[PDB]
Symmetry: C5
Subunit: 376 residues, 5 copies
């Protein structure tokens, strides 16, 4: 994930222009190899045409170049790319939206599961750990970075996500399917046990806990679904062939023909087909954005930081349920205890952001005395 929010906070002079000097997660990184292959092929073709063809063979090559340049427009590259890239971007944001965060559940566990003794500590930690374990099992199923971190359940045990007892229980339950669902059943059973044992004081609080845990389970299921049900291979193949065929046709249709022949479009003979290179940049860059976002859980620069999310979730959820349980700042009267209209100060750098309240669009409408009179 490359963040440039801070850079683009204000619309300034060449705001996006200053982003063209970025290498990490950039268009240049995505397509320099493809571009180099295309450039090598283009110049090989030019040198063959200019130094390994007789007059009649050069006339044949020129006729073919005119034909290819004329019929390039048949390829619906823009239409295919637009459809495909919109679909990939929509899926990409959905996939992020379905990353499970234990924050709601961890506040509920911290609050509802009672006891500052060792049994309460153990119970709260085990519940939040079941949520983290379920998340990590799905994430190592669908993310190459998480898989390379935890290539086995023994790795998960060594990293502290699973205890040896949990690992043995998983092995005993083993079915011929992904077992990422097991920690949710464990969570439900342990929450029921906590309520029956008096650690959860009310079935309403038990219901709240299970609702949060089930939300996380649905998010994990969506992640599994996106990893399983790929964008149809036929769509991917259509877009790939469109782009490749366009820029293979360009290799012959965008050559600089002999200016002596004074062809209708070939009066000026540059050496660098700058507009062909820009077209390659735009269209192959569109395809490269699709390629990078099609699996947002790979190891691209703009792919999600799944490992960071796993680490942060573990740290925050454990802190919240264990150390922050019934551990509050002293409740004292605040700065505005008897001020009916609190007005927090502004700094010299923010004084210009003090605004009068917007009171609705109708506020400034003006009416006469007779206009405002009620009729019988």
């Amino acid at each position: 994930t490359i963040t440039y929010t801070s850079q683009v906070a204000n619309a300034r002079l060449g705001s996006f222009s200053r982003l063209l000097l970025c290498w990490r997660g950039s268009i240049y990184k995505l397509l320099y190899g493809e571009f180099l292959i295309f450039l090598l092929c283009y110049y090989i073709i030019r040198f063959i045409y200019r130094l390994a063809l007789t007059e009649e063979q050069q006339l044949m090559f020129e006729k073919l170049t005119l034909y290819c340049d004329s019929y390039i427009q048949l390829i619906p590259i823009s239409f295919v790319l637009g459809f495909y890239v919109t679909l990939v971007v929509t899926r990409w944001w959905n996939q992020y939206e379905n990353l499970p965060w234990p924050d709601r559940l961890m506040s509920l566990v911290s609050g509802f599961v009672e006891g500052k003794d060792e049994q309460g500590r153990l119970l709260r930690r085990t519940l939040i750990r079941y949520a983290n374990l379920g998340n990590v099992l799905i994430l190592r199923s669908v993310s190459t970075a998480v898989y390379k971190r935890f290539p086995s359940a023994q790795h998960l045990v060594q990293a502290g996500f699973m205890t040896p007892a949990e690992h043995k229980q998983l092995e005993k339950l083993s079915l011929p399917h992904n077992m990422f669902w097991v920690p949710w059943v464990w969570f439900a059973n342990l929450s029921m046990k906590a309520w029956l044992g008096g650690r959860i004081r009310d079935p309403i609080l038990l219901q709240s806990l299970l609702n949060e845990m089930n939300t996380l389970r649905t998010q994990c299921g969506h992640l599994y679904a996106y990893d399983w049900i790929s964008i149809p291979l036929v769509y991917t193949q259509v877009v790939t062939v469109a782009v490749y065929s366009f820029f293979l046709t360009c290799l012959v249709g965008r050559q600089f023909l002999n200016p002596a022949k004074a062809y209708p479009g070939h009066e000026l003979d540059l050496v660098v087909p700058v507009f062909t290179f820009l077209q390659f940049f735009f269209y192959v860059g569109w395809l490269k954005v699709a390629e990078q976002l099609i699996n947002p859980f790979g190891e691209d620069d703009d792919d999600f930081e799944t490992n960071w999310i796993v680490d942060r979730n573990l740290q925050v959820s454990l802190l919240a349920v264990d150390e922050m349980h019934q551990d509050l700042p002293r409740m004292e009267p605040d700065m505005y205890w008897n001020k009916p209209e609190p007005q927090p100060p502004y700094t010299a750098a923010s004084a210009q952001f003090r605004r009068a309240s917007f009171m609705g669009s109708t506020f400034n409408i003006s009416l006469n005395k007779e206009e405002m009179e009620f009729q019988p």
Copy 2:
């Protein structure tokens, strides 16, 4: 369903190019027969024109070819295809999103329905079985693969989804409508009986169970609706006629006329209309993706694995409610029992994915001492 998530995890050199060597669920599989028919017709027309026409008749054919090539652009093939394919893809992902998974309900049943004795086992298994039976009844209504597996309710009884008593009850209730709704009414009644009999300890837990079951019912209803309310036949017919008319016009408009006549666009006479073939590939491939996804519950390669989903759901839900009921791993203090900042290790293959926390876009903003001062 063809999955290539693993292949497209990272944007590499010709990432999508390597997907053109896939046969299963590919564009070649979808349109080789149509393409062969088109090629045969194109070459029959070429041979007729070149070997069964006098000079004047060949001049007439050339005038018709120029006319057809000129007026091909009248067909709004791209506009029609774009609309239609976006609609089909949206429906396709909705249809997947409405496949019922018993995971939420099965965690709730495992937890809330009490008793390790035979009556508790029977009750939990029967509730989860009612959820599975409702799902399978809708799936065999809307999916050809599931129907071919279970072509009758007697097949459902032989496969263990329904008991003979349930089959008799369904026959007694028979109305002139799809009866996929019956297991939900059975579930509600059996849950009420379980709560009245003390197996469910609280009406709040009963409410949670019924909410999960009703979510599944709404998903099943959406599946029924998508199977019933097809995309309007008029839209389908418009797109079909557009594509067919375009590539029937091409058969005469894309012939290679006599290069002797030196026509404005006909200077070079290839034998293979490569750009016409690429256009056929793109446009008929778009139509073929729509054709494959229009009913995602058929037996295409990229259609959903409904039979696998049925099997997995049955296995997982039965395991969760029966064997995993009040059967938890031993609760022991975890690896980070007294570590306030747990730091799971990285492997040598993942050490590069260790990232500093993103602390917000404003973190690196720099201000002066006077800028940061509060004003009165």
Copy 3:
């Protein structure tokens, strides 16, 4: 509603081509009259030009035909049609999604409202009948087919949706607004009475009932809103004028001029403007799909089966709450009572749909012994 899901289950050879032999709810049915009017006008114009004009008058007509053919492209027919048709299709699927189904509510009523005696029967039937009556009142407000079935509240009483007492109560409550909301207030009051009378054992179950009933009320409100707030007349008028002006210009711009004049585009003189006819087919077909779906509750072939939905809802809801109340199949141990990995059989027609479980995209990643080692 025309269903062809079964026909389009698999992408086969000319899958959509076989749908062009459908008459009911077809493009031919939608625009044969318009097409015949257009054809008659086109040929009247051709005959006038060819048999009722002098040489100079024919030259004037030819200049006008060239001018019209040149300036046809000014009309943004495709852009206007695309916007309009996307809007109509989105509204159409929303309108279907807001058709109220009593299934969730009827399972809750069957379960929660207790008593196998006459008072319990009466109470459950009356609650589900209030839900059906609310649905039917909105449906006869917004659907021409339902209105023609029930052109008065006396018709509703004769059909059994309303009792004479309910009809008198509605007449007493009469306000100068659509009264489709009344049965929801009746439902809330009768549910409160049932809970106070002991027929509903818990306020949590009462809350569940009222939540389901209120969901139905919100769906009915959405139906009312779509019937009231039409797509803006200005959008409709813009699209209509675009299509009509395009095909009125075509009547003069697409005539076959005298081939003697050998005009740049008029070398070949057919009698049938086939490409103009195809353009009419596509564009007027797009407009006709919009026309048919703009009110999906009319009496078109592809309009919703509101009458069938009303009948089915009444039958199913009454059966569910009355006959199926506390009437369950015998609970006996299932086929897989002691089989930890149930494997339902496959038929010979479905054996090919047996699939290995997808275990996640990272499953086949290969790593070295040193790659998988944790670092300190």
Copy 4:
């Protein structure tokens, strides 16, 4: 709001054509003044060119007309308009979806708040009145029609939406912000008081009431947000300049040059630029639809009927909570008391809408005896 649902119920011959004879909320009403200004300017320019220019000055004007006609295509009017109009239409339907209806809340208040005595009447009326007052305060903030009806809180008191005591309380609470939120805090406090006083029998019912009231509050907040956060002025200015520049260029580029000069596109000299007028109609009509829907709470013909909604909501909510409280039709056995398959009759006008139930797409699949056999 102009409704034509009834007119467009069925796709008939010239279904949309018959809508071109509508004046109220029509394209002609929206752009006749702009069109008249454009026509006057066009003909002033034509008369200047034809009667106030020498030969050389007319040649200069003709060169400028050819130049302008050639370079008209540079303006991306269609692209800008498409984006803008889609955005405005999406916002418009959201704005309607966020109009608060008290129906759910009023059924809950009617049911849950107990007592047929004066205190119960007063309590129920006051709660529903707080919901109506909150709605009206936001609506008079964001709607010009509602503001012109209630230009002051004293107007609200005179119209009966607020009591003098409520007005005094609002004045006492006055902050420098829109106070539309106050009635929600009043509602929460009065509901708490009703539950503590025994008028609400259970905290679950209190929770239901507060959930409905909070849904209304979120809708009101969305209305406030749409009124405050306008579509960006930069988008609006871009679209306006595109359309204006296009039709100012047209004034000189679409003149009929001297047919004597026999220019490539100027052979025929009409007096009325019919295609320019149609382009103005389409493009300015698109802009006018955007202009009308950008604030759907103004006083356009197609703007929302906020005043009617306010009146209806007040009447219906008061009736529901006061007169309809515990006031039900007599519960008697219905028409189908002992009919397991109720079949409501059809009229002669609806007999054709009787349909057989759709039983799923797989119903008609045919299989052999060996195909349907289970394999071991």
Copy 5:
């Protein structure tokens, strides 16, 4: 945020035209510097060509200008810009939708947390303050204006959002991540303490409070996600390069060549390339709208008023929970106490907005006596 809702309430003559005289948050403000740079470069190039080139060098420049003008169309500027701007606008409205408003929570806290004594005051104020503190911590993480107001937690303490005890607790809990989540855990714990201490009378009300607080937490998480996961840099770079390359090509391709050469498109030699300037206006204006909305929490004119929202939320939430707690207007019978059909008056300015109720589209359908008869 620039609001012009009031200006665009009604579609009037040149409704959007009157918005072109706006400077704040306008297209002119966004791109005057870029436009001036472009104009300076264009005229430098013109003067170089006309005053620093020999005849042959001018012929070379003219050939290059024709070549560039011909090949400008290769850049898919419109397609790239459309995709990008739609994505930015969608994200922008989502970002606004995820701004947390404490209104729902504050009504629930005002109602449910009991006690008019100092402990009740303190408890209610502390809960609402935890909600405000969580909101402000996320807002200063993601908003430059809020950060410049509160560049440190010590600033938050001085402004009254945090007490010194809360600041010390945050420092003690410090992890290497954004700590905006901490106040939600504090809220959950303090709500649990309030319920155990009798200040919250029921666990159902506790559940309601925690649901509202968790909704706010999810909104804050969405804000964090949008600030972290930027639109992919590759998309941004593609759009930037497209626009820049288009208007750098224009600098040479849109020069006025020597009219003496009488080139096909260069007959008339203006000095100002008006259509090039309009294209710059449109396309760079599209890019500038994207640039301004890409981070809606910067300090642009059309950026959100985060500081105003923070101030208003603090003031309103404190007033609601403290002064408005169990402080209601006197409950007296309303204006329509015994009026079954209340009819609030209209003013002379609003009498035209009195409308008859819309009773559904089927209301005016006419049927015969035989049509309306039920058949047996």
